[PDB]
Amino acid sequence: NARYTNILVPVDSSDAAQAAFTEAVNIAQRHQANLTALYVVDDSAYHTPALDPVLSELLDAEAAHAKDAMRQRQQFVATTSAPNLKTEISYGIPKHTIEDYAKQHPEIDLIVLGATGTNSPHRVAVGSTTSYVVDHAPCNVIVIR
Amino acid sequence: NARYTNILVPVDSSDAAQAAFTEAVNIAQRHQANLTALYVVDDSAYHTPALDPVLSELLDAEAAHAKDAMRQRQQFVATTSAPNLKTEISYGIPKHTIEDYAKQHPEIDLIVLGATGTNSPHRVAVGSTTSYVVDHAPCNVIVIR
Amino acid sequence: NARYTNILVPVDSSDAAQAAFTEAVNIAQRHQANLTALYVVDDSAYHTPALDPVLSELLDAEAAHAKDAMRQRQQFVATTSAPNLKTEISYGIPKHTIEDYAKQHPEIDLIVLGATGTNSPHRVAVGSTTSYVVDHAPCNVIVIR
Amino acid sequence: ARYTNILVPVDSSDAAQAAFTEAVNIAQRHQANLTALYVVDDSAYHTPALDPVLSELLDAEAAHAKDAMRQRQQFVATTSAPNLKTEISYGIPKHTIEDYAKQHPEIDLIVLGATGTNSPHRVAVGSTTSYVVDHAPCNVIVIR
Ligand SMILES: Nc1ncnc2c1ncn2[C@@H]1O[C@H](COP(=O)(O)OP(=O)(O)OP(=O)(O)O)[C@@H](O)[C@H]1O
Ligand SMILES: Nc1ncnc2c1ncn2[C@@H]1O[C@H](COP(=O)(O)OP(=O)(O)OP(=O)(O)O)[C@@H](O)[C@H]1O
Ligand SMILES: Nc1ncnc2c1ncn2[C@@H]1O[C@H](COP(=O)(O)OP(=O)(O)OP(=O)(O)O)[C@@H](O)[C@H]1O
Ligand SMILES: Nc1ncnc2c1ncn2[C@@H]1O[C@H](COP(=O)(O)OP(=O)(O)OP(=O)(O)O)[C@@H](O)[C@H]1O
Ligand SMILES: [Ca+2]
Ligand SMILES: [Ca+2]
Ligand SMILES: [Ca+2]
Ligand SMILES: [Ca+2]
């Protein structure tokens, strides 16, 4: 019977992304699929070179919070029958970085995304990351709400 | 342990939609969910009352063809372990009708869609019916490519 | 001191598109630009070859109605200081045809569009033809509402 | 009929500056008021302990946006455009631009670049433009 083999679940810090992760674990268990959770630290903030260290302080703190969240997720997955969890934090423009991750790891056959994220839940029904990735992903994409 | 209960798969006459239907059957099998396939006959063409019978002839043929496709899908589904298939042909503006179907049958907890359809596979990676439904659906949506 | 030289105003049969045309003539007058109004007859309806005559009867009537609206538009432009009006009725998928038209005539340096059209004013603030054209046009695009 | 009040939201990109330049061209022809708006995006993830770090960053970005505004004020003085209001706000850009137009309902044109700082090698129209075209109460023109 036909199955997903390699799932990607991009997550920001939002409850909607965490609900997408939870469903991605459920999908991974059902299909006995590999699972990768990816947080992108957005590094595109305008700055002159003089402000490099202030930007690093901000992003490295964001990265550390994201790593603490991934550690809790690894513990959670160990209580399920999903076979594994790889966790990854990378820096870049989130939507581009998600697209490139999928395209440059072509074994990935599903992306699981929250409908919304940290910025726009009381303004749109679907955020611009989700919309972009739906558009540009080389594989199936499921939007969780 | 959450599972889908009632899956809606909107189909046009395209191969992309038929691939979406095949996956919806796989999801319905794995979840033992109810499945409904829905073809919308687009009835919005410009016409004066004098041309009603001409348009009616064209739309009635399209409907009949869609019903032929549906009969074949019922036969397919009987070769699988999916519980059932409800088949529906509706007249309306496709993206609005899909949205309304999901909102008006709120037990629907997944919509399955092809990325593209009959019109633009050669111009876009995601068609405007998909993009509309991803935005406006009250439930999870999965885009199949 | 740049000016437009060759403006395209795609119209459907909606009031919103006619308000677009009205503004296109205003822009045309100001820049002393050439103006082209383009109505696309959507010929993408599902039909087998036995049905071509039924479809053609529908499309020819739509085309004839469009031609009468163009006649009225030529009359209106002659009451203004806008240099001219070319009118065109084409057959194809509307958003594709508009894109192709602007690429076929690269002199075109503005496309003027209504925000919405005949199908979706009660569902969206901007229609799918307009968003497609904003995305895909090789030149500036103004949206009229 | 003519435009009375034009808003031209700008980021720091060349695209946006081309948008600004056309906005001046439109403003002169119509003898419309012109406002240029730069929104400092303040949505970065951060805990309270990091408030002052983010403040430092955003305040520098704001300051650069002001140097751009000053150079634009000087350009507009060379033209017969009636005026330039310059403004710098803090918030989510696309939301802020929408709010600005609905909170100043005299605005009858928004002029935008097709793309901006982040995505010209990925999309033909950016997400800020997309959102404003959709949510604006008035005409919107996309410059490319
Ligand atoms: N930085 C990121 N890293 C990884 N995944 C992300 C990131 N940002 C968003 N996502 C994924 O995309 C989903 C939707 O977030 P998105 O950014 O589209 O919404 P939003 O922030 O509410 O709106 P917008 O950013 O368009 O204002 C999230 O639930 C998450 O799954
Ligand atoms: N008339 C319809 N009835 C039911 N579902 C449809 C209909 N039209 C499209 N869909 C669904 O949406 C999916 C994508 O089709 P969509 O219409 O968005 O693409 P397209 O025809 O290529 O592009 P567009 O119509 O934007 O030019 C289809 O695979 C199908 O699942
Ligand atoms: N067939 C056409 N020929 C020329 N221009 C068109 C055509 N259809 C739409 N347009 C142009 O696009 C503008 C917006 O129409 P659009 O089709 O996007 O909106 P809609 O019909 O309300 O929504 P949708 O088709 O997405 O449901 C119109 O005001 C017109 O300028
Ligand atoms: N922070 C801002 N303040 C004011 N105007 C802006 C801002 N950001 C973008 N704009 C306006 O929107 C136009 C398009 O920028 P947009 O942000 O949509 O493109 P992008 O940065 O290339 O893509 P994206 O942000 O979707 O990755 C700009 O040229 C500018 O006119
Ligand atoms: Ca976001
Ligand atoms: Ca379609
Ligand atoms: Ca339309
Ligand atoms: Ca941007």
XYZ file of C-alpha atoms and ligand atoms in Angstrom:
707
model
C 0.000 0.000 0.000
C 1.337 3.421 -1.197
C 3.031 5.657 1.427
C 4.928 8.921 2.095
C 8.624 8.282 2.791
C 10.036 11.662 3.729
C 8.032 14.472 5.318
C 9.147 18.039 5.886
C 7.388 20.210 8.418
C 8.520 23.817 8.472
C 7.743 25.509 11.789
C 7.924 29.089 13.109
C 7.230 29.859 16.771
C 3.411 29.968 16.338
C 0.720 27.676 17.786
C -0.503 27.104 14.197
C 2.916 25.778 13.175
C 3.006 23.561 16.248
C -0.406 22.122 15.267
C 1.072 21.449 11.828
C 4.009 19.630 13.523
C 1.580 17.535 15.594
C -0.294 16.455 12.503
C 3.021 15.831 10.671
C 3.927 13.397 13.520
C 0.542 11.653 13.017
C 1.141 11.398 9.249
C 4.692 10.080 9.866
C 3.368 7.388 12.214
C 0.663 6.278 9.751
C 3.081 6.065 6.852
C 6.163 5.031 8.884
C 7.857 7.986 7.164
C 10.992 9.930 7.995
C 10.175 13.360 9.419
C 12.177 16.597 9.354
C 11.125 19.768 11.267
C 12.792 22.968 9.939
C 12.853 26.379 11.554
C 14.148 29.263 9.474
C 15.719 32.208 11.295
C 14.927 35.129 8.971
C 18.188 36.976 8.384
C 17.040 39.578 5.897
C 16.612 42.566 8.240
C 18.000 45.794 6.837
C 21.308 46.684 8.452
C 24.561 48.416 7.579
C 27.760 46.422 8.488
C 28.031 48.473 11.695
C 24.997 46.656 13.109
C 26.132 43.081 12.431
C 26.630 42.178 16.181
C 23.280 43.579 17.278
C 21.567 41.518 14.525
C 23.519 38.385 15.611
C 22.447 38.851 19.212
C 18.816 38.909 18.087
C 19.050 35.980 15.700
C 21.201 33.796 17.894
C 18.637 34.156 20.706
C 15.832 33.242 18.214
C 17.890 30.242 17.106
C 18.398 29.148 20.689
C 14.629 29.270 21.411
C 14.016 27.300 18.243
C 16.580 24.657 19.379
C 14.893 24.333 22.757
C 11.585 23.842 20.936
C 13.133 21.119 18.679
C 14.506 19.313 21.756
C 10.969 19.148 23.257
C 9.696 17.869 19.915
C 12.305 15.105 19.820
C 11.129 13.951 23.255
C 7.519 14.030 22.089
C 8.177 11.912 18.972
C 9.981 9.297 21.125
C 6.624 8.601 22.878
C 5.011 7.782 19.463
C 5.558 5.067 16.908
C 6.833 7.529 14.329
C 10.296 6.113 13.366
C 12.297 9.334 13.674
C 12.701 13.062 13.852
C 15.483 15.107 12.313
C 15.476 18.734 13.383
C 17.102 21.597 11.537
C 17.535 25.367 12.127
C 18.789 27.379 9.174
C 19.183 31.074 8.399
C 17.716 32.664 5.300
C 14.487 33.994 3.886
C 11.969 31.459 5.217
C 9.847 30.849 2.093
C 12.873 30.587 -0.213
C 14.663 28.380 2.279
C 11.695 25.984 2.574
C 11.392 25.775 -1.214
C 15.126 25.166 -1.646
C 15.130 22.517 1.141
C 12.456 20.546 -0.702
C 14.059 20.938 -4.099
C 17.602 20.192 -2.912
C 16.420 17.124 -0.902
C 14.200 15.624 -3.573
C 13.342 12.513 -1.510
C 10.931 14.800 0.374
C 7.391 13.884 -0.842
C 5.186 15.959 1.528
C 5.437 19.416 3.166
C 3.168 20.129 6.086
C 2.518 23.804 6.953
C 0.320 25.755 9.177
C -2.209 27.984 7.421
C -0.988 30.982 9.316
C 2.028 31.856 11.472
C 3.170 34.573 13.827
C 2.257 37.724 11.804
C -1.017 37.615 10.096
C -3.581 35.353 11.734
C -6.136 38.194 12.392
C -5.535 39.652 8.894
C -5.427 36.737 6.443
C -6.690 33.168 6.270
C -3.402 31.911 4.747
C 0.030 33.503 5.213
C 2.474 34.431 2.502
C 4.954 31.614 3.412
C 2.299 29.034 3.021
C 1.054 30.532 -0.182
C 4.551 30.730 -1.659
C 5.434 27.156 -0.682
C 2.122 25.800 -2.048
C 3.010 27.523 -5.270
C 6.681 26.577 -5.483
C 7.015 23.161 -3.814
C 7.990 20.246 -6.038
C 5.803 17.842 -4.038
C 2.436 17.561 -2.330
C 1.753 20.182 0.335
C -0.870 20.004 3.065
C -2.077 23.085 4.889
C -3.210 22.504 8.479
C -5.869 24.615 10.230
C -5.550 10.016 17.778
C -7.162 12.284 15.205
C -8.291 10.906 11.829
C -10.193 12.415 8.874
C -13.904 11.571 8.883
C -15.208 13.188 5.694
C -12.981 14.038 2.730
C -13.990 16.170 -0.231
C -12.186 15.863 -3.515
C -13.217 18.481 -6.138
C -12.405 17.242 -9.609
C -12.499 18.849 -13.037
C -11.837 16.805 -16.244
C -8.037 17.009 -15.969
C -5.451 14.330 -15.361
C -4.152 16.460 -12.459
C -7.574 16.286 -10.812
C -7.783 12.535 -11.406
C -4.362 12.104 -9.721
C -5.827 14.128 -6.815
C -8.805 11.807 -6.728
C -6.526 8.757 -6.555
C -4.692 10.201 -3.589
C -7.946 11.173 -1.880
C -8.958 7.489 -2.129
C -5.606 6.506 -0.560
C -6.145 9.006 2.285
C -9.779 7.828 2.730
C -8.460 4.221 2.909
C -5.832 5.016 5.546
C -8.240 7.029 7.664
C -11.404 4.978 6.819
C -13.094 8.331 6.072
C -16.137 9.042 3.980
C -15.213 10.316 0.512
C -17.118 12.695 -1.781
C -15.967 13.606 -5.228
C -17.493 16.836 -6.607
C -17.448 18.126 -10.193
C -18.636 21.690 -10.699
C -20.197 22.500 -14.076
C -19.279 26.150 -14.637
C -22.551 27.910 -15.519
C -21.250 31.524 -15.547
C -20.693 32.089 -19.274
C -22.021 35.335 -20.747
C -25.430 34.844 -22.353
C -28.768 36.497 -22.869
C -32.038 34.621 -22.126
C -32.349 33.807 -25.888
C -29.224 31.633 -25.596
C -30.346 29.705 -22.438
C -31.201 26.521 -24.402
C -27.913 26.641 -26.265
C -25.920 27.006 -22.985
C -28.162 24.344 -21.319
C -27.257 21.910 -24.086
C -23.547 22.483 -23.638
C -23.685 22.250 -19.800
C -25.934 19.206 -19.743
C -23.425 17.376 -22.019
C -20.566 18.369 -19.690
C -22.561 17.112 -16.695
C -23.296 13.803 -18.350
C -19.578 13.321 -19.151
C -18.642 14.094 -15.574
C -21.179 11.481 -14.463
C -19.481 8.942 -16.754
C -16.135 9.744 -15.066
C -17.843 9.347 -11.695
C -19.314 5.944 -12.493
C -15.722 4.828 -13.337
C -14.448 6.219 -10.052
C -17.088 4.246 -8.098
C -15.761 1.120 -9.893
C -12.187 2.044 -9.034
C -13.015 2.643 -5.396
C -14.654 -0.828 -5.206
C -11.247 -2.372 -5.956
C -9.843 -0.614 -2.866
C -10.525 -0.728 0.869
C -11.792 2.820 1.056
C -15.240 2.663 2.731
C -17.297 4.502 0.166
C -17.669 7.097 -2.542
C -20.374 9.725 -2.868
C -20.350 11.413 -6.272
C -21.840 14.824 -6.863
C -22.191 17.108 -9.902
C -23.072 20.735 -9.109
C -23.644 23.804 -11.317
C -22.074 27.115 -10.173
C -18.807 29.031 -10.158
C -16.332 26.189 -9.298
C -14.215 27.895 -6.592
C -17.252 29.427 -4.844
C -19.165 26.110 -4.998
C -16.295 24.158 -3.456
C -15.918 26.697 -0.681
C -19.693 26.618 -0.033
C -19.765 22.801 -0.099
C -17.136 22.649 2.633
C -18.741 25.380 4.778
C -22.270 24.069 4.359
C -21.181 20.470 5.152
C -19.017 21.376 8.151
C -18.279 17.677 8.925
C -15.852 17.917 5.984
C -12.342 17.881 7.483
C -10.113 17.625 4.369
C -10.214 18.944 0.851
C -7.997 17.306 -1.704
C -7.122 19.247 -4.862
C -4.895 18.981 -7.861
C -2.259 21.696 -8.149
C -3.485 22.553 -11.659
C -6.508 21.702 -13.797
C -7.697 21.885 -17.371
C -6.735 25.432 -18.194
C -3.321 26.476 -17.077
C -0.998 23.457 -16.442
C 1.422 25.042 -18.924
C 1.421 28.556 -17.377
C 1.190 28.222 -13.572
C 2.360 25.804 -10.848
C -0.919 26.288 -8.906
C -4.277 27.167 -10.493
C -6.672 29.863 -9.299
C -9.321 27.354 -8.056
C -6.717 25.712 -5.797
C -5.373 29.019 -4.554
C -8.904 30.254 -3.783
C -9.849 27.055 -1.914
C -6.576 26.870 0.042
C -7.346 30.395 1.209
C -11.072 30.093 1.931
C -11.511 26.493 3.159
C -12.587 26.065 6.776
C -10.486 22.864 7.069
C -7.195 21.258 6.114
C -6.410 21.308 2.396
C -3.887 19.158 0.526
C -2.595 20.022 -2.896
C -1.527 17.052 -5.034
C 1.191 17.230 -7.668
C 9.139 63.281 -17.799
C 8.368 59.733 -18.989
C 4.991 59.108 -20.664
C 2.960 56.099 -21.699
C 2.909 55.454 -25.417
C 0.661 52.356 -25.865
C -2.018 51.412 -23.305
C -4.028 48.180 -23.125
C -7.356 47.987 -21.349
C -8.722 44.437 -21.247
C -12.478 44.491 -20.649
C -15.141 41.888 -19.868
C -18.798 42.813 -19.781
C -18.781 44.014 -16.170
C -19.364 47.526 -14.844
C -15.982 47.266 -13.104
C -14.230 46.706 -16.450
C -16.099 49.623 -17.998
C -14.987 51.896 -15.136
C -11.414 50.648 -16.024
C -11.945 51.588 -19.655
C -13.202 55.029 -18.596
C -9.974 55.644 -16.667
C -7.851 54.230 -19.503
C -9.280 56.890 -21.823
C -8.420 59.527 -19.224
C -4.816 58.256 -19.006
C -4.665 57.986 -22.794
C -5.813 61.640 -23.167
C -3.182 62.825 -20.640
C -0.207 60.994 -22.125
C -1.533 61.278 -25.666
C -1.029 57.527 -25.853
C -2.385 54.957 -28.229
C -5.232 53.025 -26.594
C -6.399 49.451 -27.266
C -9.540 47.852 -25.675
C -9.421 44.047 -25.704
C -12.349 41.689 -24.975
C -11.461 38.015 -24.713
C -14.168 35.458 -25.538
C -13.405 32.509 -23.246
C -13.400 29.457 -25.477
C -12.137 26.935 -22.847
C -15.524 25.268 -22.126
C -15.521 21.517 -21.970
C -17.041 20.145 -25.179
C -16.571 17.175 -27.569
C -16.270 17.876 -31.273
C -19.968 17.085 -31.865
C -20.752 20.142 -29.727
C -18.598 22.739 -31.638
C -21.667 24.303 -33.302
C -23.535 24.674 -29.986
C -20.398 26.343 -28.442
C -19.773 28.487 -31.523
C -23.361 29.808 -31.391
C -22.783 30.777 -27.739
C -19.397 32.407 -28.393
C -20.514 34.226 -31.543
C -23.381 35.819 -29.572
C -21.006 36.837 -26.786
C -18.591 38.223 -29.413
C -21.399 40.184 -31.085
C -22.394 41.749 -27.751
C -18.759 42.671 -27.089
C -18.548 44.228 -30.590
C -21.540 46.417 -29.799
C -19.912 47.536 -26.538
C -16.734 48.408 -28.539
C -18.808 50.457 -31.010
C -20.131 52.492 -28.058
C -16.619 52.894 -26.707
C -15.296 54.274 -30.080
C -18.111 56.811 -29.977
C -17.186 57.903 -26.427
C -13.449 58.292 -27.178
C -14.291 60.622 -30.135
C -15.825 63.059 -27.611
C -12.405 63.275 -25.853
C -8.893 64.430 -26.773
C -7.526 60.884 -26.567
C -5.695 60.253 -29.835
C -7.407 56.991 -30.819
C -8.990 53.661 -29.960
C -8.229 50.295 -31.430
C -10.755 47.614 -30.397
C -10.043 43.910 -30.435
C -12.126 40.840 -29.754
C -10.084 37.670 -29.295
C -10.823 34.038 -28.458
C -8.840 32.136 -25.794
C -8.328 31.809 -22.076
C -8.666 35.421 -20.932
C -5.714 35.901 -18.540
C -3.356 34.043 -20.933
C -4.552 36.030 -23.911
C -4.029 39.356 -22.152
C -0.486 38.336 -21.135
C 0.241 37.096 -24.654
C -1.172 40.254 -26.163
C 1.184 42.455 -24.092
C 4.161 40.234 -25.086
C 3.040 40.086 -28.717
C 3.000 43.908 -28.732
C 5.995 44.873 -26.607
C 5.353 48.571 -27.260
C 2.533 48.283 -24.737
C 3.641 50.067 -21.537
C 0.528 49.989 -19.399
C -2.288 47.558 -18.821
C -5.416 48.983 -17.166
C -7.712 46.477 -15.340
C -10.797 46.497 -13.201
C -10.200 45.015 -9.778
C -13.118 42.549 -10.206
C -15.215 41.381 -13.159
C -18.385 39.381 -13.874
C -17.927 36.427 -11.426
C -16.488 37.334 -8.007
C -17.249 40.779 -6.585
C -19.099 39.145 -3.657
C -16.185 36.802 -2.857
C -12.890 38.706 -3.520
C -11.517 42.297 -3.663
C -9.370 41.358 -6.675
C -10.227 38.817 -9.332
C -8.071 36.009 -10.615
C -7.677 37.551 -14.132
C -6.355 40.740 -12.564
C -3.978 39.031 -10.118
C -2.664 36.824 -12.975
C -2.041 39.851 -15.204
C -0.438 41.892 -12.426
C 1.944 38.956 -11.915
C 2.702 38.100 -15.488
C 2.670 41.377 -17.426
C 5.947 42.726 -18.840
C 4.932 46.342 -18.049
C 3.244 48.533 -15.485
C -0.273 47.462 -14.434
C -2.898 49.651 -12.743
C -5.928 48.239 -11.024
C -9.075 50.357 -11.036
C -11.728 50.325 -8.305
C -11.189 63.738 -12.996
C -7.674 63.582 -11.572
C -5.768 62.086 -8.609
C -5.697 64.220 -5.490
C -3.655 62.240 -2.985
C -1.101 59.549 -3.904
C 0.704 57.243 -1.471
C 3.934 55.561 -2.506
C 5.113 52.940 -0.036
C 8.873 52.398 -0.329
C 11.366 49.887 1.054
C 15.080 50.317 0.356
C 15.136 48.633 -3.053
C 15.850 50.066 -6.525
C 12.409 48.757 -7.591
C 10.683 50.833 -4.922
C 12.722 53.899 -5.884
C 11.596 53.488 -9.503
C 8.079 53.328 -8.101
C 8.749 56.598 -6.209
C 10.069 58.269 -9.373
C 6.945 57.394 -11.317
C 4.839 58.525 -8.371
C 6.418 61.977 -8.736
C 5.693 61.934 -12.462
C 2.029 61.094 -11.755
C 1.801 63.695 -8.988
C 3.072 66.506 -11.282
C 0.642 65.636 -14.079
C -2.324 65.433 -11.765
C -1.156 68.131 -9.357
C -1.847 65.625 -6.615
C -0.489 65.564 -3.047
C 2.248 62.872 -2.679
C 3.189 60.916 0.472
C 6.069 58.434 0.602
C 5.885 55.793 3.373
C 8.572 53.477 4.722
C 7.394 50.871 7.263
C 10.027 49.533 9.639
C 9.029 45.863 10.033
C 8.906 45.286 13.832
C 7.742 41.666 13.839
C 11.032 39.852 14.502
C 10.876 37.072 17.068
C 12.136 38.259 20.479
C 11.650 37.846 24.251
C 11.333 40.905 26.552
C 15.009 40.717 27.505
C 15.783 41.478 23.863
C 13.472 44.518 23.404
C 16.408 46.948 23.523
C 18.469 44.934 21.045
C 15.605 45.015 18.538
C 15.006 48.698 19.285
C 18.595 49.451 18.306
C 18.235 47.659 15.017
C 14.915 49.211 14.033
C 15.994 52.714 15.045
C 19.047 52.479 12.692
C 16.834 51.210 9.859
C 14.439 54.133 10.481
C 17.389 56.577 10.389
C 18.532 55.220 6.984
C 14.958 55.485 5.698
C 15.096 59.180 6.739
C 18.275 59.792 4.713
C 16.469 58.320 1.722
C 13.411 60.530 2.426
C 15.602 63.618 2.582
C 17.156 62.814 -0.823
C 13.609 62.351 -2.191
C 12.426 65.654 -0.743
C 15.310 67.308 -2.662
C 14.412 65.549 -5.898
C 10.748 66.627 -5.689
C 11.794 70.288 -5.228
C 13.301 70.130 -8.718
C 9.848 69.233 -10.133
C 6.474 70.946 -10.472
C 4.867 68.280 -8.198
C 3.048 70.272 -5.556
C 4.503 68.608 -2.420
C 6.066 65.602 -0.685
C 5.052 64.329 2.717
C 7.553 61.729 3.984
C 6.721 59.231 6.680
C 8.253 56.347 8.559
C 6.102 53.948 10.518
C 6.718 50.787 12.576
C 4.607 47.644 12.033
C 4.009 44.815 9.516
C 4.514 46.539 6.138
C 1.559 45.230 4.127
C -0.874 45.614 7.095
C 0.494 49.126 7.757
C 0.093 50.247 4.147
C -3.485 48.960 4.059
C -4.284 50.720 7.351
C -2.664 53.978 6.138
C -4.823 54.073 3.020
C -8.036 53.240 4.917
C -7.147 55.710 7.727
C -6.504 58.470 5.136
C -9.466 57.879 2.851
C -8.556 60.897 0.660
C -5.833 58.683 -0.836
C -6.951 57.786 -4.295
C -3.812 56.029 -5.695
C -1.201 53.701 -4.275
C 1.988 53.317 -6.318
C 4.137 50.250 -5.639
C 7.135 48.517 -6.980
C 6.524 45.065 -8.370
C 9.218 43.589 -6.180
C 11.296 44.808 -3.232
C 14.394 43.872 -1.253
C 13.815 40.151 -0.731
C 12.335 38.354 -3.749
C 13.214 39.753 -7.201
C 14.981 36.483 -8.135
C 12.045 34.357 -7.018
C 8.738 36.147 -7.954
C 7.544 38.729 -10.547
C 5.362 40.400 -7.875
C 6.160 40.449 -4.134
C 3.898 39.579 -1.237
C 3.607 43.219 -0.005
C 2.384 44.335 -3.431
C 0.083 41.342 -3.765
C -1.514 42.095 -0.399
C -1.980 45.820 -1.065
C -3.391 45.290 -4.537
C -5.983 42.999 -2.885
C -6.769 45.029 0.261
C -6.569 48.653 -1.007
C -9.657 50.812 -0.987
C -8.397 52.699 -4.079
C -6.651 52.294 -7.452
C -3.239 50.623 -7.211
C -0.535 50.784 -9.794
C 2.350 48.368 -9.958
C 5.614 49.699 -11.405
C 8.114 47.494 -13.200
N 10.506 31.097 9.656
C 9.880 29.971 9.339
N 10.505 28.773 9.376
C 9.834 27.642 9.096
N 8.549 27.580 8.762
C 7.836 28.733 8.728
C 8.464 30.007 9.046
N 7.545 30.981 8.880
C 6.411 30.365 8.524
N 6.580 29.018 8.443
C 5.551 28.001 8.084
O 4.523 28.614 7.308
C 3.290 28.598 8.055
C 2.514 29.883 7.785
O 3.226 31.043 8.228
P 3.214 32.394 7.412
O 4.534 33.088 7.560
O 2.779 32.046 5.999
O 2.030 33.176 8.109
P 1.990 34.602 8.838
O 3.309 34.836 9.514
O 0.817 34.589 9.709
O 1.756 35.650 7.638
P 2.889 36.549 6.887
O 4.255 36.060 7.285
O 2.511 36.337 5.455
O 2.509 37.925 7.382
C 3.659 28.376 9.488
O 2.633 27.821 10.308
C 4.867 27.475 9.343
O 4.386 26.135 9.166
N -15.018 22.681 -12.084
C -14.387 22.121 -11.061
N -15.039 21.325 -10.200
C -14.425 20.702 -9.184
N -13.113 20.889 -8.960
C -12.357 21.682 -9.767
C -12.950 22.383 -10.880
N -11.999 23.143 -11.503
C -10.854 22.891 -10.802
N -11.085 22.047 -9.747
C -10.098 21.554 -8.775
O -8.991 22.462 -8.677
C -7.808 21.856 -9.145
C -6.916 22.897 -9.856
O -7.613 23.458 -10.992
P -7.573 25.009 -11.308
O -8.909 25.333 -11.972
O -7.112 25.826 -10.155
O -6.359 24.976 -12.359
P -6.367 25.460 -13.884
O -7.614 25.155 -14.670
O -5.197 24.875 -14.562
O -6.091 27.045 -13.730
P -7.096 28.312 -13.948
O -8.554 27.868 -13.934
O -6.677 29.137 -12.750
O -6.658 28.857 -15.279
C -8.245 20.696 -10.015
O -7.221 19.716 -10.158
C -9.449 20.215 -9.233
O -9.003 19.367 -8.129
N -12.680 37.983 -20.793
C -11.993 39.112 -20.523
N -11.454 39.916 -21.507
C -10.780 41.028 -21.174
N -10.594 41.472 -19.923
C -11.068 40.736 -18.893
C -11.796 39.492 -19.129
N -12.168 38.976 -17.953
C -11.696 39.823 -17.009
N -11.030 40.871 -17.585
C -10.403 42.004 -16.908
O -10.056 41.675 -15.572
C -10.730 42.531 -14.658
C -11.054 41.646 -13.451
O -11.854 40.537 -13.858
P -11.665 39.098 -13.091
O -11.996 38.057 -14.115
O -10.311 39.012 -12.517
O -12.718 39.175 -11.904
P -13.973 38.206 -11.567
O -14.607 37.676 -12.807
O -14.827 38.981 -10.605
O -13.250 37.053 -10.730
P -12.787 35.558 -11.128
O -12.832 35.379 -12.628
O -11.434 35.334 -10.466
O -13.831 34.743 -10.427
C -11.951 43.040 -15.408
O -12.492 44.222 -14.842
C -11.350 43.190 -16.784
O -10.612 44.404 -16.782
N 8.701 47.987 4.448
C 8.058 48.635 3.484
N 7.570 49.870 3.639
C 6.915 50.499 2.644
N 6.729 49.975 1.422
C 7.154 48.719 1.154
C 7.866 47.972 2.180
N 8.206 46.778 1.683
C 7.736 46.739 0.407
N 7.109 47.913 0.076
C 6.526 48.223 -1.246
O 6.189 47.010 -1.944
C 6.940 46.846 -3.134
C 7.140 45.335 -3.343
O 7.905 44.785 -2.272
P 7.660 43.301 -1.716
O 7.957 43.344 -0.249
O 6.237 42.921 -2.103
O 8.740 42.497 -2.581
P 9.933 41.565 -2.032
O 10.598 42.131 -0.817
O 10.729 41.376 -3.269
O 9.148 40.186 -1.762
P 8.684 39.457 -0.378
O 8.762 40.433 0.700
O 7.326 38.904 -0.734
O 9.661 38.296 -0.239
C 8.183 47.707 -2.877
O 8.800 48.007 -4.137
C 7.569 48.884 -2.130
O 6.923 49.820 -3.046
Ca 5.290 34.754 8.788
Ca -9.624 25.771 -14.021
Ca -13.699 36.705 -14.474
Ca 9.621 42.577 1.102
